[PDB]
Ligand binder design. Structure first.
Ligand SMILES: OC[C@H]1O[C@@H](O[C@H]2[C@H](O)[C@@H](O)[C@H](O[C@H]3[C@H](O)[C@@H](O)[C@H](O[C@H]4[C@H](O)[C@@H](O)[C@H](O[C@H]5[C@H](O)[C@@H](O)[C@H](O[C@H]6[C@H](O)[C@@H](O)[C@H](O[C@H]7[C@H](O)[C@@H](O)[C@H](O)O[C@@H]7CO)O[C@@H]6CO)O[C@@H]5CO[C@H]5OC[C@@H](O)[C@H](O)[C@H]5O)O[C@@H]4CO[C@H]4OC[C@@H](O)[C@H](O)[C@H]4O)O[C@@H]3CO)O[C@@H]2CO)[C@H](O)[C@@H](O)[C@@H]1O
Ligand SMILES: [Cl-]
Ligand code: NA
Length: 492
């Protein structure tokens, strides 16, 4: 039971190459959560090339998770029967997560149970999307059975396993399935998600803004998160700080450079009453914050833009216990929140119906709206769920993965949706009412699209743009990355 020391880096170092940076433009930028012409716009505008350094970063990161999980699983043979099944359960959970991410970025990817290690650059084929689902599910089922129902602050539980496995079943339900969601998968998703919702004994944090404070790492709503070391050494700190934060006035002096702004389209998703989630995600004019710049009575953003609040914990003195320096944020990276399980339950209860007007699924939906301190809905559609998921998880680097899942379910719907997100548009001044307005002054406020700063190249998003390309460097090393995927031969 020094396994625990070997399974520990599965939460931090394993994910580092991914989390270092790429996680933001890919997870949140390609969803058009937010935007900058000078910080990797191409992900927002669908102009990404095979040479893109974020693709390389992300791709190595996820496979680093895979390598380490496989090292551990193997290592559990190169070294108590309950300590061992737990260790393997953690490795395979992370391995499922890494692939479930890749599956919704590239689609086909290479399925590796065995690292080889003797061969620097193995020539392995891509495996089919359905095989990648079945691999992820094999891993999650093991983690469901072999993780415990409660654990130490920061470690995985069987509730997390069930949580993920509910999202996976929901995502497979409609994937390439000819316009309908598979009822078998919908039922599987309902039962894993309702079992978490009803039996975990867990509860949403009363205040949504609390989720995103250092002092609240591994709260009861955090089912699975990247456990970053406060002021950690390289390979084990959260380096996203300087990329997220727009000005030193919100970092207690620490160096930063973010030019990201919440997108027109993203800011428009927030209902008029939904300002607790909006505030906790982006700064907008007038927005007050008691827990940032605590020394000066709190910070009030007084600009006309939409810089990122979420992932910007404030200064080292702003209840962060001094754990804030450049490229060193003390926040965990969320992977799965209980809120996500609530919405996932809901979507799985909607199923193939137009509307959902009753049941426990709608209860856990409204339960999320309840926390945002906004009005419940008496019935919901898929479009409500999409919108609720966007505002709930804005700037948590996961809205793109969901949009890919949806695109895989209703491709023409979502292509029309991607093309009506004002992608690449921006506006001089976002001003606030008594309600958000988008435009500019000109010598008096000019409102609407006509006064947006429009992109000046072609943006016509089509099916082949959605999944990103394989990183060119890897393609050169393994030419099968250009060939059709093949069926994986599963192990029994
Ligand atoms: O035009 C009209 C219009 O204009 C408007 O204005 C615009 C303007 O036009 C536009 O130019 C502008 O653009 C900005 C942009 O918005 C901004 O974000 C960007 O900033 C960059 C910074 O300048 C730059 O310093 C920063 O550098 C960091 C790297 O990005 C980062 O990857 C790197 O990390 C290193 C790490 O440092 C190192 O420690 C590490 O070492 C490890 C080692 O690897 C281990 O092996 C070992 O174990 O441990 C070691 C550590 O212990 O390796 C990492 C990389 O792998 O860190 C650097 C900086 O780091 C530090 O050290 C070096 C010191 O010199 C430095 O001081 C110190 O910080 O990158 C920023 C952007 O980053 C990334 O994303 C963007 C992309 O382009 C980059 O390629 C990418 O790197 O700057 C530009 C401009 O310069 O926006 C303007 C508006 O704001 C007007 O407003 C309008 O009116 C006009 O009309
Ligand atoms: Cl693209
Ligand atoms: Na359009």
């Amino acid at each position: 039971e020094a396994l625990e020391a070997a399974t520990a880096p599965l939460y931090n170092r394993a994910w580092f190459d991914y989390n270092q940076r790429s996680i933001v433009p890919i997870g949140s930028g390609r969803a058009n959560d937010m935007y900058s012409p000078w910080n990797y716009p191409q992900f927002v505008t669908f102009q990404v090339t095979a040479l893109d350094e974020n693709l390389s970063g992300a791709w190595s990161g996820f496979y680093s998770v895979v390598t380490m999980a496989n090292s551990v699983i193997n290592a559990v043979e190169t070294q108590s029967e309950a300590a061992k099944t737990k260790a393997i359960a953690e490795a395979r959970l992370m391995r499922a997560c890494a692939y479930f991410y890749m599956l919704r970025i590239w689609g086909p990817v290479i399925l590796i149970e065995d690292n080889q290690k003797l061969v620097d650059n193995p020539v392995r084929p891509l495996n089919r999307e359905e095989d990648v689902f079945q691999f992820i599910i094999n891993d999650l089922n093991y983690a469901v059975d072999n993780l415990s129902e409660q654990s130490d602050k920061g470690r995985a539980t069987s509730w997390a396993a069930k949580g993920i496995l509910a999202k996976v079943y929901l995502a497979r339900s409609g994937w390439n399935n000819g316009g309908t969601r598979d009822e078998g998968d919908l039922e599987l998703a309902r039962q894993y998600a309702s079992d978490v919702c009803e039996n975990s004994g867990l509860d949403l944090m009363t205040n949504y803004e609390d989720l995103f404070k250092y002092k609240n790492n591994n709260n009861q709503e955090s089912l699975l998160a990247m456990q970053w070391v406060p002021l950690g050494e390289w390979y084990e700190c959260n380096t996203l700080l300087s990329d997220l934060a727009f000005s030193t006035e919100v970092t207690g002096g620490v160096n930063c450079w973010s030019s990201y702004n919440g997108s027109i389209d993203m800011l428009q998703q927030y209902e008029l009453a939904d300002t607790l989630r909006r505030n906790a995600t982006f700064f907008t004019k007038g927005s007050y914050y008691s827990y940032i710049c605590i020394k000066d009575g709190g910070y009030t953003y007084k600009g006309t833009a939409s810089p990122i609040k979420k992932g910007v914990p404030g200064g080292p003195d702003d209840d962060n216990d001094g754990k804030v320096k450049q490229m060193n944020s003390p926040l965990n990276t969320y992977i799965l929140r209980l809120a996500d399980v609530y919405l996932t339950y809901a979507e799985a209860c909607l199923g193939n119906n137009s509307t959902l007007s009753d049941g426990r699924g709608l209860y856990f939906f409204n339960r999320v709206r309840e926390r945002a301190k906004i009005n419940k809905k008496s019935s919901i559609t898929l479009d409500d769920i999409i919108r609720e998921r966007r505002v709930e998880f804005g700037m948590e680097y996961s809205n793109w993965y969901d949009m890919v899942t949806w695109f895989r379910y209703l491709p023409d719907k979502m292509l029309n949706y991607f093309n009506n997100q004002w992608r690449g548009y921006r506006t001089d001044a976002i001003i606030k009412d008594e309600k958000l307005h988008f435009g500019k002054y000109d010598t008096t406020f000019l409102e609407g699209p006509e006064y947006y700063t429009a992109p000046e190249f072609t943006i016509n998003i089509e099916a082949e743009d959605i999944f990103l390309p394989y990183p060119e460097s890897d393609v050169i090393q393994n030419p099968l990355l250009n060939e059709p995927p093949v069926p994986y031969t599963f192990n029994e």
